Amino acid sequence: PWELTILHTNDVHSRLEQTSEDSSKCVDASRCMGGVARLFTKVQQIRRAEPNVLLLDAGDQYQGTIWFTVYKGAEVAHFMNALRYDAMALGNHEFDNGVEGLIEPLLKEAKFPILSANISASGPLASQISGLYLPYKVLPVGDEVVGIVGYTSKETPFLSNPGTNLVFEDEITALQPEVDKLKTLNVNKIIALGHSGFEMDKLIAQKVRGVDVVVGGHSNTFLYTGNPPSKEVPAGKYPFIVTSDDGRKVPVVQAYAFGKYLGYLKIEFDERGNVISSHGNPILLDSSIPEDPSIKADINKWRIKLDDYSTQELGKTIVYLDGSSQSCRFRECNMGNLICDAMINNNLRHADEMFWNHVSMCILNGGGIRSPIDERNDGTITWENLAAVLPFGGTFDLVQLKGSTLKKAFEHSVHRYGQSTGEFLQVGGIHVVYDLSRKPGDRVVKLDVLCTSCRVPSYDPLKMDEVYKVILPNFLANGGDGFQMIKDELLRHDSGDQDINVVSTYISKMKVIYPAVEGRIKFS
Amino acid sequence: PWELTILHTNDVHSRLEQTSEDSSKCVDASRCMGGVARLFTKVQQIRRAEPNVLLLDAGDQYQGTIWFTVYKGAEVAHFMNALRYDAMALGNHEFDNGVEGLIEPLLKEAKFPILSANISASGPLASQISGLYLPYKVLPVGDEVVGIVGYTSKETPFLSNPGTNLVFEDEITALQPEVDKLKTLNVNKIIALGHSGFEMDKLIAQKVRGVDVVVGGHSNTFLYTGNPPSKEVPAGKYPFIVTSDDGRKVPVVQAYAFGKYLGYLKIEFDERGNVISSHGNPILLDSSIPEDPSIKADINKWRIKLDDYSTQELGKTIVYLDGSSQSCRFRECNMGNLICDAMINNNLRHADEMFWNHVSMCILNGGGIRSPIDERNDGTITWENLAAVLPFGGTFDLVQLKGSTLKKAFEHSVHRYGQSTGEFLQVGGIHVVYDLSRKPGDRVVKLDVLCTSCRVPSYDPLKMDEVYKVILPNFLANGGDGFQMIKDELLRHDSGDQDINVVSTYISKMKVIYPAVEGRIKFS
Numbered sequence A, B: 001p002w003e004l005t006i007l008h009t010n011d012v013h014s015r016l017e018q019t020s021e022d023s024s025k026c027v028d029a030s031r032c033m034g035g036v037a038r039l040f041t042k043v044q045q046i047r048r049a050e051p052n053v054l055l056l057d058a059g060d061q062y063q064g065t066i067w068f069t070v071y072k073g074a075e076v077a078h079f080m081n082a083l084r085y086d087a088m089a090l091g092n093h094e095f096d097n098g099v100e101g102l103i104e105p106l107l108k109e110a111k112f113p114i115l116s117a118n119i120s121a122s123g124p125l126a127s128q129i130s131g132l133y134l135p136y137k138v139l140p141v142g143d144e145v146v147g148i149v150g151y152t153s154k155e156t157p158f159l160s161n162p163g164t165n166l167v168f169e170d171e172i173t174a175l176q177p178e179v180d181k182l183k184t185l186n187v188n189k190i191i192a193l194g195h196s197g198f199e200m201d202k203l204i205a206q207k208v209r210g211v212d213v214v215v216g217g218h219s220n221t222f223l224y225t226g227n228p229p230s231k232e233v234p235a236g237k238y239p240f241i242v243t244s245d246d247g248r249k250v251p252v253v254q255a256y257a258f259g260k261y262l263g264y265l266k267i268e269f270d271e272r273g274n275v276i277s278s279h280g281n282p283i284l285l286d287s288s289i290p291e292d293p294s295i296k297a298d299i300n301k302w303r304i305k306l307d308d309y310s311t312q313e314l315g316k317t318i319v320y321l322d323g324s325s326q327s328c329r330f331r332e333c334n335m336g337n338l339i340c341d342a343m344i345n346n347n348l349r350h351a352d353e354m355f356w357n358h359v360s361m362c363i364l365n366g367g368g369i370r371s372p373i374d375e376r377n378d379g380t381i382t383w384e385n386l387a388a389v390l391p392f393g394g395t396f397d398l399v400q401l402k403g404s405t406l407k408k409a410f411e412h413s414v415h416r417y418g419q420s421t422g423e424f425l426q427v428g429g430i431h432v433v434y435d436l437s438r439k440p441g442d443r444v445v446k447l448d449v450l451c452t453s454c455r456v457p458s459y460d461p462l463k464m465d466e467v468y469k470v471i472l473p474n475f476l477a478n479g480g481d482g483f484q485m486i487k488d489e490l491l492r493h494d495s496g497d498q499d500i501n502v503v504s505t506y507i508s509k510m511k512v513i514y515p516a517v518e519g520r521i522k523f524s
């Protein structure tokens, strides 16, 4: 039997440095986790012990910290080249800076193949990008070869900025003929590596004949066999076994997000490329694994430009930005309005004739707003100022919620009003009126929402059965601040851009801001 | 006696081409007026007949048409140099593109002295601008000399973009020592040429000892002795005689605006520089005066880049811009919101610790909105599209109105609601609620306004005795669409930027717009 060791990452999201246990800023270094210097140590150790190793990334290196803001993907090519990745699939966030922001910094600089079989280009872009990403690559491993076939979320146009000159095809439709072609080329060991989420990964494993292993991402899925080593709760066993339509057992793997774990799957193959066995588990990259000193020293050199950038003027405010708890946990605050307006601006995507924009609505818990910004420093706003407002290292995510769920969220917002608690909601594209004289659970007396399926945006009453797209913090999508109804009732969730980055981009674009308190939230 | 002919313009405001009788676009060429080619003809004729002639401009050549938008003052230097102006005073609109937009195109290119005695600079700007404008110039005229002393509105920081490195001094305080110094230099014939408005011009004539003549501007004042030749109604005789504190008769002149008239004042002086007599009248530049063919051919050559610019993309909309009368004469319309938001953005000026911005409020009659803009031309917006929305060649002006006046304006807005009439108001920084079941004059049931004297902008009830700054069309400041209360009751009026230009600048800055209907105007 021929044994392959698959090492894999996904949704690293700009965690070049070690992090806290929750993937935010490292404060207590003796208990920090992840980062590329520690990954380097572990990969190097495994490559010293195992003959046949592939190191794969399932996409979404782009977006997540000030690293991406400043280096715009150059850090991804540099550090992925230093760890000698064997292949990467394109994720949705690889399109955040458009096609141009993918071609240059990443496709032209990577020393490893970058894969997606379900993205096509037309017009002059097709010539410009031809061969810079591939449907698949056949890689030599010891005396054998392994085919790696890529895929990227069909939903990327709604979740990033790929532009109007790329088409994202159905993953299974695109994959099958490529896997069929590899079999004609005498390649009998096939890995599907891609970025569509665990549910699609299971469909690919079931339906794409000839796929031996699926290595996925996007959904930040944690799989584990046994007692988990940290706080993440497994969604299933590692690997997750799918019974294929042709009667084979096909392992499906993912490795959470943020570089906290290295996925590790051992596969035994027979002479004909059938999987005989698969076993493994993600490895927690905790402080017991030393950071490689060389990579750490390069990280520290690259940090200098981040420190410099952190104190530069992004733009100006002519108004006090009221992020005080005394305001934002009690009533509409202009900091809340600013952040929600930034959130909606970040989620402007290509719009057909059926909507002005696919999403119009935002909620933001007041507990997530942690500082004001004074306008009397010549109006300057810096990244450091925004990091005091938004200190948790979160994202502003896209969800789909029934109107009944959103009404329950607004009732929760004021259920125990008057105690300075974090659940009070700041809003965009929503007008709410509360009557605090009513019983908890029955305090929302008006709730109007901005249309999407309209040429002129205007407000209509919320409909209990309609499904709304809403931008909100990952903290709320995960049921933080008692929003268990959002976690339990949402119909779709996709992780978005870094919180600070969303607001910094908006401020830079606007140049001078003056957010008002304008009646989005009233009391009767 | 030594006789001087003073020819003078003021507030030409980018009317390089001949205009209609109302100073808008020329449609019926056989009845058009003004423009620099016709001015050239008349000036040349007078200089052939009169030995001692000065041609003076009292400021505000900048701002008013697409000429200024595209050529940014290069057209002003070029055509003022071609007509051989003898001197110009700085107007408020000469600062619309900042100090940098005055130094280059105008101060470095003019072949005539540019004057203001009451503007000082500090820091590095003082070195950069030293001598590029002067307090005064002594000009030879025949065998004599004439001193010309300039001044510029002390209110310029509120009415343009001069920046924080210029100080505008009290005009009379600054002028007196300069006029005193000219007398020590044996200059006994002194013209005060400046840009503060007719009321200040009369104060200068009264109080600045040694001023023989005041040639003013800013207030677009029309003076005439006799039956007027066109539609403008005189504010007084030409010249307007002020009795000075030292007992002299001091003539004060102005010549309306828009290049429609050439001011013409004949002064007789004695040997000691005392005015013996003054008489004259502005000359209507109507179609009986031919356009100079050479200047007209140069105007037509410069027009090519304007035509090209007119069809260029300024920015994008992802929403239908509803400028239909069926919307904007009946309810809040998103075109109205866009234009008022552009108006407030245009009037962001330097703000001390006492206000976030000096003005927060906007009204716009629906009758002034003359077209929608469709978003389905790939979202493109062009100048030509904006000219269909705003076709009248107006300005967005700054006024001061008591709250009682503004309440009367909102009652007028709906006094005869339901007939598709032009007075229905679109708004910014104002939230109004109407009850149409009430008697005309008593339909406004809520009227809240955005604060200025606040660090966080928020809405408060309108106060009847408080004076508000409001941005509104010149058409309304002049009592158009039945707003006689605005004309009759306003406390201050200053003309603003060209309507199209205000909206085009905002669209270019924003890049992608998506104005909503959001509840600024409600019905109960």
Ligand SMILES: O=c1[nH]cc(I)c(=O)[nH]1
Pocket (backbone or CB within 6 Å): A365, A367, A368, A369, A392, A422, A475, A480
């Ligand atoms: O909004 C929040 N995000 C994360 C934490 I931890 C919290 O208290 N609040």
Ligand SMILES: O=c1[nH]cc(I)c(=O)[nH]1
Pocket (backbone or CB within 6 Å): B365, B367, B368, B369, B392, B422, B475, B480
């Ligand atoms: O708003 C307007 N400006 C100018 C005219 I003439 C008119 O009808 N309406």
Ligand SMILES: [Ca+2]
Pocket (backbone or CB within 6 Å): A188, A189, A190, A210, A211, A212, A272, A273, A274, A275
């Ligand atoms: Ca196989």
Ligand SMILES: [Ca+2]
Pocket (backbone or CB within 6 Å): B188, B189, B190, B210, B211, B212, B272, B273, B274, B275
């Ligand atoms: Ca004199």
Ligand SMILES: [Zn+2]
Pocket (backbone or CB within 6 Å): A011, A013, A060, A093, A218, A219, A495
């Ligand atoms: Zn991701």
Ligand SMILES: [Zn+2]
Pocket (backbone or CB within 6 Å): A060, A091, A092, A093, A195, A217, A218, A219
């Ligand atoms: Zn993803």
Ligand SMILES: [Zn+2]
Pocket (backbone or CB within 6 Å): B011, B013, B060, B093, B218, B219, B495
């Ligand atoms: Zn003017």
Ligand SMILES: [Zn+2]
Pocket (backbone or CB within 6 Å): B060, B091, B092, B093, B195, B217, B218, B219
């Ligand atoms: Zn002026």
